[PDB]
Amino acid sequence: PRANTKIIVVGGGGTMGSSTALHLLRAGYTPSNITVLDTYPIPSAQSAGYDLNKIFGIRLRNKPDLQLYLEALDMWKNDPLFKPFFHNVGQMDVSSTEEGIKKLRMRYQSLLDAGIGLEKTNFLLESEDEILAKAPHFTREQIKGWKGLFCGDGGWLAAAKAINAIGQFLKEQGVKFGFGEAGTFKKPLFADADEKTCIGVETVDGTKYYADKVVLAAGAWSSTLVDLEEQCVSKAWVFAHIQLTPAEAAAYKNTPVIYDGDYGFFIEPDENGIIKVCDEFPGFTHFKMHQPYGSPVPKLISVPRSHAKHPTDTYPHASEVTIKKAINRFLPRFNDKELFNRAMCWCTDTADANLLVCEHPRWKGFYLATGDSGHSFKLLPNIGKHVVELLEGRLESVFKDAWRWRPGSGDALKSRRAAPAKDLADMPGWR
Ligand SMILES: *Cc1cc2c(cc1C)nc1c(=O)[nH]c(=O)nc-1n2C[C@H](O)[C@H](O)[C@H](O)COP(=O)(O)OP(=O)(O)OC[C@H]1O[C@@H](n2cnc3c(N)ncnc32)[C@H](O)[C@@H]1O
Numbered sequence: 001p002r003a004n005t006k007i008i009v010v011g012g013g014g015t016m017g018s019s020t021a022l023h024l025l026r027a028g029y030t031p032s033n034i035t036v037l038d039t040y041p042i043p044s045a046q047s048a049g050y051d052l053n054k055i056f057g058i059r060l061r062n063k064p065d066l067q068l069y070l071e072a073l074d075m076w077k078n079d080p081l082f083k084p085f086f087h088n089v090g091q092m093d094v095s096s097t098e099e100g101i102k103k104l105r106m107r108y109q110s111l112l113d114a115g116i117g118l119e120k121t122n123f124l125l126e127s128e129d130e131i132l133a134k135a136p137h138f139t140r141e142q143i144k145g146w147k148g149l150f151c152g153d154g155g156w157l158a159a160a161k162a163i164n165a166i167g168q169f170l171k172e173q174g175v176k177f178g179f180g181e182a183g184t185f186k187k188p189l190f191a192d193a194d195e196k197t198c199i200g201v202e203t204v205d206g207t208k209y210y211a212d213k214v215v216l217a218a219g220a221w222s223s224t225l226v227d228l229e230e231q232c233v234s235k236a237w238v239f240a241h242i243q244l245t246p247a248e249a250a251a252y253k254n255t256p257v258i259y260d261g262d263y264g265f266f267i268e269p270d271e272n273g274i275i276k277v278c279d280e281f282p283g284f285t286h287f288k289m290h291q292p293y294g295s296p297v298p299k300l301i302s303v304p305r306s307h308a309k310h311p312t313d314t315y316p317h318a319s320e321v322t323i324k325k326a327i328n329r330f331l332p333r334f335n336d337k338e339l340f341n342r343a344m345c346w347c348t349d350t351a352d353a354n355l356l357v358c359e360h361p362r363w364k365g366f367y368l369a370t371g372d373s374g375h376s377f378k379l380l381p382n383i384g385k386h387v388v389e390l391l392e393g394r395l396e397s398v399f400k401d402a403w404r405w406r407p408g409s410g411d412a413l414k415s416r417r418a419a420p421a422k423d424l425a426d427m428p429g430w431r
């Protein structure tokens with residue numbers, strides 16, 4: 001029974017883990033029976049979700065994407081917990097290249113092909129005037145030859161604030177926590193030597209926690225903690241910030257998120273005048289000698305270099321270049337603004353960019369909830385609902401089949417991106 005079942009959520013201070021703990025409580029699990037184990041207190045300072053903001057938008061790449069997006073949208077708009085953090089300013093993808101404009105048009109046509117009426121809130125913008133109408137901060141000269149795809153249901157999400165909001169509730173309810181070494185997963189605990197039955201976890205300080213079920217929602221670290229058999233390859237993306245005065249920020253108030261696949265994106269200034277800028281590239285790995293559990297020997301694994309643990313890192317010189325190109329493309333009036341709070345943010349890619357959400361094939365009672373593939377902050381409100389369905393043997397096949405255990409299913413180093421990721425050992429300047 002739910003009220004009598006003990007769950008441990010490893011990575012419970014991050015995106016998928018906090019969502020899961022939330023939905024355990026909403027399903028009627030007893031709060032004191034839920035233990036969140038995260039290296040950092042929620043919201044985890046090293047979580048990919050520990051960010052001023054993130055984009056919410058529709059992206060149909062795999063079978064469950066449409067239902068997941070609609071689910072999330074409903075809750076970002078209507079869930080009392082999450083709705084303060086969704087800013088429905090819309091999103092506009094732009095391009096001025098022949099191939100880029102082709103991609104926009106095809107993406108639009110894919111929305112239409114869903115047959116549910118997405119054309120009502122998503123529009124191709126074929127003229128300069130139409131683009132300026134949605135994004136008045138542009139100049140007419142700047143956008144010569146641009147085409148746009150405007151997604152009206154999109155916007156941005158106050159990410160760290162939303163995870164904090166879950167955390168405050170978990171703590172009010174009396175969820176148990178472990179942080180630091182007493183919150184850092186070392187290995188699963190098993191009833192027998194055959195490791196067919198997981199009964200808990202041990203953390204790096206030696207603390208043992210017993211439970212009926214364990215959820216590994218450790219994001220970019222999951223692949224380092226247990227042997228995922230190269231199903232997940234962890235990668236770093238980059239961002240920088242720029243500071244605008246209130247008068248500079250005024251032109252951007254409630255302006256849509258702007259994205260171009262050849263450059264990256266920026267989000268409107270937050271309440272303190274801060275604009276976050278990202279480039280667009282296939283990410284950086286960080287291979288280092290490492291030892292995951294369930295692996296007989298140390299493998300080469302891409303392991304996050306955590307900014308929270310080493311705030312003196314930034315990002316490579318090549319990233320400074322591409323983030324400045326993005327600023328020149330979108331925000332040329334701010335070309336002289338100083339970049340700051342430069343950082344790397346870690347995700348873990350599967351081969352096909354589907355989640356990896358399933359019971360471990362051998363370790364019964366141990367569940368994976370990872371493979372975020374760099375596009376899952378938007379699922380904060382709803383993904384925990386399906387993790388709980390999975391725990392309970394009620395997960396529908398559209399999700400179950402997409403999220404299944406699948407070693408050897410393709411190359412996660414390239415994933416659905418333009419190229420295999422380069423490694424930080426080959427990129428100077430971040431250290
Ligand atoms: C990097 C990034 C990602 C991103 C984005 C921009 C950047 C730069 N923009 C996005 C956007 O606009 N829209 C969107 O939907 N997603 C976007 N993303 C992706 C998003 O950040 C990630 O997909 C998502 O947040 C990942 O969720 P997940 O839960 O998988 O990962 P996490 O939040 O990092 O949580 C992992 C937690 O695990 C803890 N941890 C790590 N090691 C341990 C051990 N050993 N024991 C216990 N806990 C552990 C971490 O502390 C973390 O809290």
Ligand SMILES: O=C(O)CSC[C@@]1(O)OC[C@@H](O)[C@@H](O)[C@@H]1O
Pocket residue numbers: 055056057058059237278279280281347373374375376
């Ligand atoms: O999933 C989305 O709607 C946008 S994710 C934004 C982003 O920075 O997330 C991290 C990486 O996946 C990047 O490729 C990507 O541009």
